[PDB]
Structure 1
Amino acid sequence: LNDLLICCRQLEHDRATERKKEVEKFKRLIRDPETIKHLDNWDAVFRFLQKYIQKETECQASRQKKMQEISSLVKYFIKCANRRAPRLKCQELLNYIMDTVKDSSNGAIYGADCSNILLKDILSVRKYWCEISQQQWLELFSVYFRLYLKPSQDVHRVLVARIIHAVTKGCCSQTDGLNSKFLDFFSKAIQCARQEKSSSGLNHILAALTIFLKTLAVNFRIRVCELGDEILPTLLYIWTQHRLNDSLKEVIIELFQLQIYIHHPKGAKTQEKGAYESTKWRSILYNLYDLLVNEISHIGSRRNIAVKENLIELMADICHQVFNIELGWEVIKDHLQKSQNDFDLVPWLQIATQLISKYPASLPNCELSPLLMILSQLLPQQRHGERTPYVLRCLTEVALCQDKRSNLESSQKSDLLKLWNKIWCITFRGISSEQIQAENFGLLGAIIQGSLVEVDREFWKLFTGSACRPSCPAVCCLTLALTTSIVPGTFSLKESIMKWLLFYQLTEVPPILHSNFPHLVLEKILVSLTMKNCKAAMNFFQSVPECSFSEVEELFLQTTFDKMDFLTGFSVHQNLKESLDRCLLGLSEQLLNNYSSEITNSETLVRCSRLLVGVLGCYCYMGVIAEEEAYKSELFQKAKSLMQCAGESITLFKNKTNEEFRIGSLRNMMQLCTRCLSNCTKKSPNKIASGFFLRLLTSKLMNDIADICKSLASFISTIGAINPLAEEYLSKQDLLFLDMLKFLCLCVTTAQTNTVSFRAADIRRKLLMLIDSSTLEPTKSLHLHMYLMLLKELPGEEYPLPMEDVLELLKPLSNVCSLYRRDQDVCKTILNHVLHVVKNLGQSNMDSENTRDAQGQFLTVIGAFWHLTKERKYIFSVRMALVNCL
């Protein structure tokens, strides 16, 4: 080991003739046992390589080949050194890269090569990405940006900008942020963009500018505003005089949208509302409006005729900022009128849709009637065309804005009603078109929401027979129709509606079970169908209460003081009850008879059980039935039998763990049952349904899932580094494991409220043994994710947890904090996770030794974090996390 290294070092210091074989001898001297016994050091061989390289280069075109093979061999040495683990320290390697790239004596190919090693090794390892200091970060950024500014241009320039985005990503992710004195540097780069035409690496530069402005938007707001005011005209000139590269266009539009957010947070218009106004900025806005108007009328701006969402948002924001040369809705109406083809009509409709959806008040009350008339004229074209769904969804937010206004005069409201009735009768036909099924039901629910057009008896005929299958648009239209209208008795119409909702073929599953619906939506409609007063039940149901760069907009609003976040039992139709019960039992027999172990899936049974428990909870919340007799109903028996028949899937899975085809169905039903449960303690039908679902669950499946937790716990592009918290390290089995932990945590935290067959004490014991100190390994991503999820879910303020359990949970925090102190993202994540155990740590009625030990450990770790923050070792996000936990 040491003797071999000494011999290799001595051989490398000999003459060139001897070195010709000494290089190969040193390359072949490495071996697996040698590196196994060498684990510690690597700094010795690193500096040996350093001195060998410097002595080789110390002593034209001939030397280029020698440089090539020495670069190849040092690259091989770096790759093999970090093949297993990154033992080599990144500091000296980065200094070597810096001192070899700073000088112009080394060739550009060597610079590109060392950049490749920098990205593949330094920029691909989290430890290397995190151990770089702020001063080293900023000096490396400065030297690389100065190299990018060199007049020499080669193929590597687009490569160099790739570093620029990465390093800028590093300083804003691991450090608090470098000073603003470097901003002018980028300005000069922008000036360079005004001269060069290739723009090979300009996309990366623009992306780096966008991310840097997003990071630094917290401070230097005036500096950012003036920098934008002086830089955006250059970007406008480039856009005018460029080949319109898609990446360049999208990054430029992203920068423009960021600047609009900076200048006009949350659509602010006047100076007193928080927005910043200037003549140059207004001229820039007008020029950008003209450019967007020119560009939207292009083939490549969209076979597809739909414009991308970013363009629509940018155009709508510009229109809102400029609407009061004179601009207004008149030019929009003229463009709509003169659009003789769908190609030039769809973009304007999209712009109007987005503008009304985001800014309902941007449309004056005088122009709503002309807009409605032009939309009505453009709606029919003798058949279902491309623009038909666009117009259908454009009318939706127009109707919504009409709902959200009350200053309209009597004449105007009468005129809009006499136009909306014709709109209703026109849109009544064409519902059978399935390709616009989602769009049609958007209007029908919306208008009924505002009571603009009185519902007719013929509308109730639509939800009958096999005219349309029960889908989410259909049910969300039906519920809104039911809230503000009374179903006619033509005792039979309600029966037809119930039949259509529960249409069963006498061998395909009903569409309600096949597809997914929002939780507790069909059940409310079903229980109100039998209600004496459906409208009253509707008004009663929703009367119950409930428990990125966007946040920078609210931050600016708080800073400017524009938005103050602070200082702010019915009887039921008896006759329909037995009919509903008969339908339920019939579908129960149909589902049970055709059920099979393999061919029949399980999530359909889960959805049917959700429907049954929703109906039961709705009945319990009313005075229809009592809870005790609800427990004894045959609906409970069928719901239990559903999971009894579905448990054989888990029984087969626990024996055949290697199976990879059932994982999708199991994860589907597992996500469904997680969405079924509700952890809120308020008196709501959701709580009753969750309790029923928990009490349905048997102990055998609980034990099986707890055992397979331990069974599976033993299993063994991006510009910069990979976040350890990212999902790319998580496979399908990992996703199943995490949502399985979610389900089990919800079950253990919500079962104690009611009476269940299974005992939660042993379940919690297994959960804690899953994260046992001997078993848990902080170095593993899966184990760390499981620990964070368990810490997030186990604590609960409703009922105090045992102090032994919470101290056992808190014990493995110290080592994972120590091993991941250099990574800011994991620190902020764990700080966000640890704040939910305080609600149970605060309750200390039984002041024992364990309580004092747990609170002392928490106090010590919080104090250590506070001291670390006082040492300027944590980024701003860590500071917000610490403030939140305090």
Structure 2
Amino acid sequence: LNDLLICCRQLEHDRATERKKEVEKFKRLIRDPETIKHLDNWDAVFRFLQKYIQKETECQASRQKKMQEISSLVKYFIKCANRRAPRLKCQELLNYIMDTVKDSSNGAIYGADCSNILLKDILSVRKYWCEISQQQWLELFSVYFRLYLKPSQDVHRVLVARIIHAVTKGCCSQTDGLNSKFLDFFSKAIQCARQEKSSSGLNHILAALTIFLKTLAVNFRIRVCELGDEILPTLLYIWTQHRLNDSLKEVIIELFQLQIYIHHPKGAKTQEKGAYESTKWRSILYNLYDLLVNEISHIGSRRNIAVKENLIELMADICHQVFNIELGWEVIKDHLQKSQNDFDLVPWLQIATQLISKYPASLPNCELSPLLMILSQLLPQQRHGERTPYVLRCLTEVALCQDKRSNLESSQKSDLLKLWNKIWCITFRGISSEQIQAENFGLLGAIIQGSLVEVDREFWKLFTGSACRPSCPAVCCLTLALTTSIVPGTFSLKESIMKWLLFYQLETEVPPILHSNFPHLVLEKILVSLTMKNCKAAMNFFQSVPECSFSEVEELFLQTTFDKMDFLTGFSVHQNLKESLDRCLLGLSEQLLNNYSSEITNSETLVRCSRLLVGVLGCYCYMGVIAEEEAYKSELFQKAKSLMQCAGESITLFKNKTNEEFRIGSLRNMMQLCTRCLSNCTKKSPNKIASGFFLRLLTSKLMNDIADICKSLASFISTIGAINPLAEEYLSKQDLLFLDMLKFLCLCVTTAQTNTVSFRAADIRRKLLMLIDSSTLEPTKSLHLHMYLMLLKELPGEEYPLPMEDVLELLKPLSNVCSLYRRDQDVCKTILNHVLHVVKNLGQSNMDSENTRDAQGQFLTVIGAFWHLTKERKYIFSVRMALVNCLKTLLEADPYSKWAILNVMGKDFPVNEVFTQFLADNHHQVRMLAAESINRLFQDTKLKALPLKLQQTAFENAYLKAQEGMREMETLDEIYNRKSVLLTLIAVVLSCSPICEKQALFALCKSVKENGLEPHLVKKVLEK
């Protein structure tokens, strides 16, 4: 250490001729013991190299090579300094990279190399990706945009843009964003892009602009609309003039879609329904429709003749926004009719299909009949063409749209009935084709569900014999045929259908139903209902049970404009058929059992068949045919248990040969199947009873083997910016398998308590908690973070809480984990989202021992640390939203704040008082989440109300906070946003509280004149 420093000082003090050899001497001076003893410093040798460079650069073109050399040297040094871990501090290295490229004296290749080091070594490391402050991000963005905007053109310009694309992604996701005054830069980069044909970095500049606009859309929406009005004509001109590179057009389409989303949130058409309108925007919309219409009739817009879907969605959005120069469905019908070849006809079919599906009200009922006639004329060509699957999908969308309308005239309905009968006649013939089985059966199901065509006896012949194989579309059409019709008697047809569904090929192909996954409890319901006295009643009874991006910004816009307000809103069975079904099931199960081999036979097929058996039993037990106790003694249960035993030995084999990789593919599939076999929902349904039967299937040995393999698997050892540590690309096949079996074990432990099972849930839960033991758990490891997060999310349950010791063990590693990932915003948000599920077990103070108090304090200190850091401006709006959600859950679990008090700096804060503070936040999303969730302060929400004084003081504090947020105030967007929060809070209080109704109404009356609330808006709220 000291000797190395002395040698470095001597080399630095040597003469230039001596320094020439001293460079190589210092390069070779590094060694493994030197690095081992140097772990802390590296900054000392960094400044040594820095003054060496500053002295060398001062002393023609002959210097250029030297520069290259020294560049390589520092690069090599960096690669040697940060190879094992990022020991080198980000700050001074960032300033060095800043000022080496800031000056123009350095060579262009030197600047390109320095930018290469910046991109590949600084911005590619998560730690440096996080420790960069907001000022550093803004200065790097500014200087690099100045570099890009320079008139000098080289290859490195492209590499400049890739830096900016990175920098913006680092500025919009790790800090509170960059100021809106930076919108000029991009605008400049756009305007010059009009002149130069090269457009070296436009592909990355526009992609970074998309991220900036997405971040800058929650606030300053009018500013973004004006920016779009400014730049969109230039983008249209670029599209028309440019060489049309696929990446550039793809990014431009994304920008156009973002602009449409911002202007028309979720299809808002009129200004009074949430849309923002301008004359320039309307002209832009018409020009962009013309551009898309022209560009669609191109070879590259798509062997395959289908236009890429993003173009189709953009075209459909534009058409919906410009349909009422006159535009309408007339041009679509004309293009559908006149076009001869399928090249120019498929795009219009796709446009019509997407427009009808996304906007069912966009097609007038007067034009429905001509469209149906055109589609019927387009169906047949005596054979199967390229256009047929698209025509079938368009017809399916039309059929689904028709059934959603009740204002249809009788003459119109009777005319459409004839066309639908003709359509059925056309499509039913030619159903034997395997290529369009999905589309054909989808059209048939759409027609049947709406009762558009009376089902004939020929239809029921489809699900018999070898006419068609059992598939998801065919079974989904059959489950609607049973729902909306009665099977004819051609004891014979029902038995034939049951045999067709359960037809097993004798002696080695698996039956088709076992081969492919089917929707849960869909085959079982059909099979059970086919044996019932009244098939249609059984189907309807089964169907009557209840089941268990930029969209958020559009919802926030709608809430801000107040167009969206979430608040203020026994049977009898044919014995012969029942026994025939049991005979078929026994035959299939024993056929699987005998054909099963310990090595070659698949495992997910056995699990699928056992799922079918237990689903049939659960469907029978849901009705009055069979009780649970008798179902436990049925031969179907024994066959399912044997199937489970056969499947378990596949896991048992893997328990020893963990090194295998081909086993993992099947093991993951079978784990997913077993996971979806269960159901955590508690409402009585066939799903719950089937899940109970499947729970009783599992044995103790299989569960112990799964737990042992999970224990073993945890002991093992391009992208724009740095990779998220929670990213899926860090997960190997074994890691994914471990995550699957961990979820399966968690579900089994959670839902075992309701029934009586062969395995002990306590031991498995003890092993699961042993997985996150302090000695073994390494939070920095990617797999261990996922495992801990999954355990935090899945283990707690309000209905049957964890023992307080188990909850204490669960929260034990939380503080260290949060300390480790303090600077990572995404990981902090995920941790806050996942720790919210502990509050349900935490809240119950029935066993108010030392353990309950300890667990409550342990959770509250972690939440208080996050709140204190948030007040210290250490977290972005996403972490603030996660914290608001956690505080909302705490308020739900303790309305009176008996125990939900967080202590910071020796000061106690009730959660109710803290939650009000977020009403005056600097981000509109957090404000409108707090305002929308403020109803927890007025009702128990466990729907009893709260005491008079508590409600009064809560409303007074919330109203004062909302007023204060307004008071401390180009800026039109902020004013509108603050008024929206005030009005939303008052409306929520009015809707959720009869005690404070008069007070809220008087507050609204006062704020109409004091805070300048727009009367036309509060009137709209008051009408609702």
Structure 1 and Structure 2 fold alike (TM over 0.5)? yes
Q: Secondary structure at the match of 1:835?
A: helix
CA distance in 2, matches of 1:579, 1:564: 54
Residues 442 and 473 in structure 1, CA contact (< 8 A), matched pair in contact too: yes
Q: Give the drift of 1:794.
A: 0.3
CA contact (8 A) 2:707 2:767 kept: yes
Displacement of 1:456: 0.5
Instruction: Give the Cα–Cα distance (whole angstroms) in 2 for the partners of residues 126 and 823 of structure 1.
Output: 9
- Structure 2: segments with no counterpart, 5+ residues: 887-1024
TM-superposed CA distance for 1:533, in Å, is 1.0
Counterpart-to-counterpart distance in 1, 2:363 and 2:637: 54
Contact 2:821 2:828 in 1 (8 A): yes
- Aligned partners of 1:779 and 1:363: how far apart in 2? 55
CA contact (8 A) 1:520 1:614 kept: yes
Shift of 1:10: 2.1
CA contact (8 A) 1:123 1:129 kept: yes
SS at match of 1:303: coil
Q: Which moved more, 1:305-314 or 1:410-419?
A: 410-419
CA distance in 2, matches of 1:463, 1:837: 50
Q: Aligned-pair distance for 1:694? A: 1.0
Instruction: Note the alpha carbon deviations across 1:449-472, whole angstroms, 9 max, x for none.
Output: 111111111100011111111010
**Could you say which residue in structure 1 is the equivalent of 2:46?**
46
For 2:812 and 2:878, the matched residues in 1 are separated by 25
Asked whether the equivalents of residues 8 and 25 of structure 1 are also in contact (C-alpha less than 8 Å), the reply is: no
Q: 2-side partners of 1:135 and 1:760: how far apart? A: 53
| 2:522 aligned with 1:508 | no
Deviation, structure 1 residue 356? 0.1
Contact 1:431 1:440 in 2 (8 A): yes
Given that residues 379 and 426 in structure 2 are in contact (C-alpha distance below 8 angstroms), is that contact kept between their aligned partners in structure 1? no
Kept after mapping to 1: 8 A contact 2:333/2:371: yes
- Structure 1 residue 284: Cα displacement: 0.6
> Given the two structures, how large is their TM-score scaled by the length of structure 1?
0.99
Correspondence for 2:642: 641
Question: Is the CA contact 2:545–2:685 (under 8 Å) kept in the aligned structure 1?
Answer: yes
* Cα deviations by residue, 1:544-575 (Å, 9 ceiling, x for unpaired): 11331111111111011112111112111111
Q: Deviations over 1:593-632 (max 9, x none)?
A: 1111001111100000000010010011010011111111
SS at match of 1:498: helix
Contact 2:202–2:248 (CA under 8 A) maintained in structure 1: yes
CA contact (8 A) 1:678 1:687 kept: yes
Output the aligned Cα RMSD.
0.8
Judge which range, 349-358 or 178-187, deviates more.
178-187
* Separation (CA, whole Å) in 1 of partners of 2:512 and 2:419: 36
Shift of 1:651: 1.7
1:6 Cα deviation after fit: 2.1
Q: Distance in 2 between matches of 1:642 and 1:421?
A: 46
Higher mean C-alpha deviation, range 471-480 or range 536-545: 536-545
Shift, 1:863, TM fit: 0.8
When structure 1 is superposed on structure 2, of 546-555 and 248-257 the one drifting more is 546-555
Residue 751 of structure 1: CA displacement? 0.7
Deviations 1:96-144 (A, max 9, x none): 0001000000111111111111111111110000000001111111011
Q: How far, CA to CA, are the matches of 2:682 and 2:722 in structure 1? A: 42
Conserved? CA contact 2:355–2:362, under 8 Å: yes
The answer as to whether partners of 1:12 and 1:23 remain within 8 angstroms in 2 is: no
1:375-427 deviation digits (Å, cap 9, x = unpaired) = 11111112100001110110001011110001111111111111111111111
CA distance in 2, matches of 1:190, 1:163: 17
TM-superposition CA deviations, 1:198-247 (whole Å, max 9, x none): 01210000100111111111010111001101100001111111111111
Contact 1:13 1:52 in 2 (8 A): no
Residues 304-328 of structure 1: CA distance to partner in whole angstroms, max 9, x if unpaired?
1010000000100110000001111
Alpha-carbon distance, 1:278 to partner: 1.4
Rounded to whole Å, the distance in 2 between the matches of 1:569 and 1:6 is: 94
Aligned to 2:837, the other structure's residue is in SS state coil
1:497-537 Cα shifts (integer Å, max 9, x gaps): 00110011123210000111111100000000001111111
Pairwise CA distance, 1:300: 1.0
| SS of residue matched to 1:662 | helix
Q: Which whole-Å CA distance do the structure 2 matches of 1:675 and 1:800 have between them? A: 23
SS in 1 for 2:281: helix
> Partners of 2:326 and 2:646 in 1: how far apart?
70
Indicate the residue corresponding to 1:129 in structure 2. Answer: 129
Q: Is the 8 A contact 1:514 1:604 kept in 2?
A: yes
**Could you tell me how far 1:146 is from its partner in structure 2?**
0.6
Q: Using the alignment, how far apart are the partners of 2:303 and 2:585 within structure 1? A: 47
Q: Does the 8 A contact of 1:131 with 1:822 survive in 2?
A: yes
Alpha-carbon deviation of 1:9? 2.3
Moved more, 352-361 or 650-659: 650-659
Q: 1:2 offset after TM fit, Å?
A: 1.8
Q: 1: CA distance between counterparts of 2:366 and 2:248?
A: 40
Distance 1:115 1:817 in 2: 33
Structure 1 distance, partners of 2:216, 2:617, is 54
Measure, in 2, the Cα distance between the counterparts of 1:708 and 1:88.
40
Shift of 1:681: 0.9
Q: 1:840: which partner in 2? A: 841
SS of residue matched to 1:407:
coil
Alignment of 1:559-598 (within 5 A): 559-598=560-599
Q: Partners in 2 of 1:707 and 1:294 — Cα distance?
A: 62
| Cα distance in 1 between the residues matched to 2:396 and 2:509 | 35
Which digits, 9 at most, give the CA deviation of each residue in 1:474-506, with x for residues without a partner? 111110111010001111000010011001112
Greater relative CO, 1 or 2 (CA 8 Å, sep 6+): 1
The offset of 1:848, in angstroms, is: 0.5
Cα drift, residue 60 of structure 1: 2.0
User: Which whole-Å deviations, capped at 9, do the CAs of 1:26-77 have from their partners, x for residues lacking one?
Assistant: 0000001111111111111111111111111122200001101110111000
C-alpha displacement of 1:3: 2.0
Contact 2:713 2:735 in 1 (8 A): no
Match of 1:552 in 2: 553
Is the contact made by 2:166 and 2:721 (CA closer than 8 Å) also made in structure 1? Answer: yes
- Deviation of residue 264 (structure 1)? 0.5
Per-residue deviation, residues 805-840 of structure 1 (Å, max 9, x unmatched)? 111110101111111100000000000000001001
Structure 1, unaligned stretches of length 5 or more? none
SS at match of 1:462: coil
Q: Distance in 1 between matches of 2:564 and 2:704?
A: 52
1:780-812 deviations in Å (ceiling 9; x for gaps): 111111000110100011101100111111010
Match of 1:459 in 2: 459
CA–CA distance in structure 2, aligned partners of residues 86 and 604 of structure 1: 49
Q: Which runs of 4+ in 1 moved over 4 A?
A: none
Contact map agreement 2:356 2:362 (CA 8 A) in 1: yes
